[PDB]
Amino acid sequence: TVFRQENVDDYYDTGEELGSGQFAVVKKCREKSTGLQYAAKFIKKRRTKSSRRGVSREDIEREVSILKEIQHPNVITLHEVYENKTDVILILELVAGGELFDFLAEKESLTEEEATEFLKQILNGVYYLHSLQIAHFDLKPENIMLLDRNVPKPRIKIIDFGLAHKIDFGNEFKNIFGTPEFVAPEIVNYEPLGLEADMWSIGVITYILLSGASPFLGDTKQETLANVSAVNYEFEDEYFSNTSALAKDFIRRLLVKDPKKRMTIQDSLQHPWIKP
Ligand SMILES: Nc1ncnc2c1ncn2[C@@H]1O[C@H](COP(=O)(O)OP(=O)(O)O)[C@@H](O)[C@H]1O
Ligand SMILES: [Mg+2]
């Protein structure tokens, strides 16, 4: 597909930089015609076929296609897309309260209620995505945004659809590898991937929410990956002594090497720690 090729600056003004990654930069912006605000994600295009710099057009279009499908309170939506010779520019719903990553850094240790208030929202967004056969493949705290960080129980949206894929056969077997501390063993081992990989990441996020510590993190990325593949984690008493056994059970049933034995998103919502 092709996108709008008028100069995005004729239609929008940009402001604060909201975040970035290796091939993307995200700027707050305001649409001239409405005064409404958005997050403009500029993704750097590849300059040749054989290049490793920038993002392939196939990969950009996959992100756009998935984003166009989705509408749920706990996911961002896509407003418009522009392009020019250097970038594709996705005009995304603005999430103005910063990353979960930054919230957790700034705040004291969470209560079990605060952790489940965040988790339940994540679960609801993932339930929506998985119902659509969309695997996110990059769930982690920098990819979850708060609407407003100055309320007791902040509301969240999942962002960053740059690794998301439609799973129409039950698994996919493309080049997909995210961040060592969050990826499932099947990613580490270069196996076909499906919705189950997201459920593993949710286990890792839950462990972080409750404890402030990352379950598999080693001193190097190779150590982290080796730990993931071996399922080398434990609940440290120093961090988990006043956390319930049911919360640990929830995590334990997600951090399972065999994807067939791991809780599904439906299972997670019916688990006794979560189910009303
Ligand atoms: N819709 C959004 N609203 C607010 N900030 C955003 C939004 N999308 C992305 N960001 C910020 O920009 C960062 C990078 O965007 P992201 O989509 O995660 O791209 P990357 O694939 O490069 O990680 C995010 O971690 C977040 O800080
Ligand atoms: Mg990201």
Question: Which CATH number fits the domain that encloses residue 48?
Answer: 3.30.200.20
Domain boundary among 72, 97, 122: 97
Both 207 and 78 in one domain: the answer is: no
- Report residue 163 as tokens: 């690794």
Both 46 and 119 in one domain: the answer is: no
**Amino acid, single-letter form, for residue 49:** K
What is the maximum alpha-carbon separation in the chain? 58
Count of CA atoms in the C-beta half-sphere (13 A) of 269: 12
Both 79 and 68 in one domain: the answer is: yes
Q: Which residues contact 122 (CB under 8 A, 6 or more apart)?
A: 74, 139, 144, 156, 158, 202, 205
- Report residue 132 as tokens: 């659509």
Report the candidate in 225, 10, 30, 201 with the shortest Cα–Cα distance to residue 100. 201
- Report residue 92 as tokens: 């995304």
Could you tell me the distance, in angstroms and rounded to a whole number, from the CA of residue 24 to the centre of ligand 1? 8
Between CA 117 and CA 124 the distance in angstroms is: 11
Domain count, the chain: 2
> Does residue 117 sit within a domain?
yes
Both 148 and 211 in one domain: the answer is: yes
Interruptions in the chain after residues (C–N over 2.5 Å)? none
Q: Which is it for strands 144-146 and 134-135: parallel, antiparallel or unpaired?
A: unpaired
Both 56 and 172 in one domain: the answer is: no
Both 237 and 216 in one domain: the answer is: yes
> Does residue 128 sit within a domain?
yes
- Report residue 161 as tokens: 């659809």
Resolution expressed in Å: 1.3
Report the candidate in 77, 89, 70, 87 with the shortest Cα–Cα distance to residue 27. 89
Between CA 154 and CA 38 the distance in angstroms is: 19
Both 153 and 220 in one domain: the answer is: yes
Report the candidate in 265, 187, 261, 263 with the shortest Cα–Cα distance to residue 228. 187
- 43 CA: nearest ligand 1 atom: 22
Both 106 and 221 in one domain: the answer is: yes
Technique employed here was: X-ray
> Does residue 57 sit within a domain?
yes
Which of 23, 25, 26 for a ligand 1 pocket mutation test, highest count of atoms within 8 Å of Cβ?
26
Could you tell me the distance, in angstroms and rounded to a whole number, from the CA of residue 238 to the centre of ligand 1? 33
| Dihedral sign from CA coordinates of 122, 123, 129, 134 | positive
Q: Which ligand is nearest to the CA of 39?
A: 1
Between CA 244 and CA 210 the distance in angstroms is: 10
Phi-psi region of 170 (alpha: psi -120 to 50; beta: other; left: phi over 0): left
Both 76 and 111 in one domain: the answer is: no
> Does residue 61 sit within a domain?
yes
> Does residue 199 sit within a domain?
yes
> Does residue 1 sit within a domain?
no
Q: What are phi and psi of 239, to 5 degrees?
A: -100, -25
Residue with CA nearest ligand 1 atom 18:
160
Give the number of other CB atoms < 10 A from CB of residue 159.
Answer: 22
Question: Can you give the residue range of the structural domain that contains 81?
Answer: 7-97
Query: Which residues belong to the annotated binding site?
Result: 18-26, 41, 93-95, 99, 160
Between CA 213 and CA 235 the distance in angstroms is: 10
Both 80 and 126 in one domain: the answer is: no
Both 36 and 134 in one domain: the answer is: no
Q: Which is it for strands 144-146 and 156-158: parallel, antiparallel or unpaired?
A: antiparallel
Classify residue 258 as exposed, middle or buried by CB count within 10 Å of its CB (0-12, 13-18, 19+). Answer: exposed
Determine the distance from the C-alpha atom of residue 217 to the mean position of all C-alpha atoms in its chain, rounded to a whole number.
Answer: 18
Specify which residues 145 forms β-bridges with. Answer: 99, 157
Any idea what the CATH number is for the domain that residue 192 is in?
1.10.510.10
Q: Report the pocket of ligand 1 as residue ranges, CB < 6 Å.
A: 18-21, 24, 26, 39, 41, 76, 92-95, 99, 142-143, 145, 159-160, 162
| Dihedral sign from CA coordinates of 25, 31, 35, 37 | negative
Domain boundary among 60, 80, 97: 97
Between CA 220 and CA 183 the distance in angstroms is: 15
Both 266 and 205 in one domain: the answer is: yes
Domain boundary among 65, 97, 129: 97
**Site of tokens 């769930």:** 139
- Report residue 73 as tokens: 């309170």
> Does residue 2 sit within a domain?
no
The C-alpha R_g of the chain, in whole angstroms, comes to 19
> Does residue 249 sit within a domain?
yes
HEC profile for 18-82?
A: EEEECCEEEEEEEECCCCCEEEEEEEEECCCCCCCCCECHHHHHHHHHHHHHCCCCCECCEEEEE
Between CA 258 and CA 24 the distance in angstroms is: 34
Between CA 197 and CA 177 the distance in angstroms is: 11
HEC profile for the chain?
A: CCCECCCHHHCEEEEEEEEEECCEEEEEEEECCCCCEEEEEEEEECCCCCCCCCECHHHHHHHHHHHHHCCCCCECCEEEEEECCCEEEEEEECCCCCEHHHHHHHCCCCCHHHHHHHHHHHHHHHHHHHHCCEECCCCCHHHEEECCCCCCCCCEEECCCCCCEECCCCCECCCCCCCCCCCCHHHHCCCCECCHHHHHHHHHHHHHHHHCCCCCCCCCHHHHHHHHHHCCCCCCHHHHCCCCHHHHHHHHCCCCCCHHHCCCHHHHHHCCCCCC
**Between 196-211 and 112-131, two packed helices, what is the crossing angle to 10 degrees?**
170
Could you tell me the distance, in angstroms and rounded to a whole number, from the CA of residue 157 to the centre of ligand 1? 11
Could you tell me the distance, in angstroms and rounded to a whole number, from the CA of residue 76 to the centre of ligand 2? 13
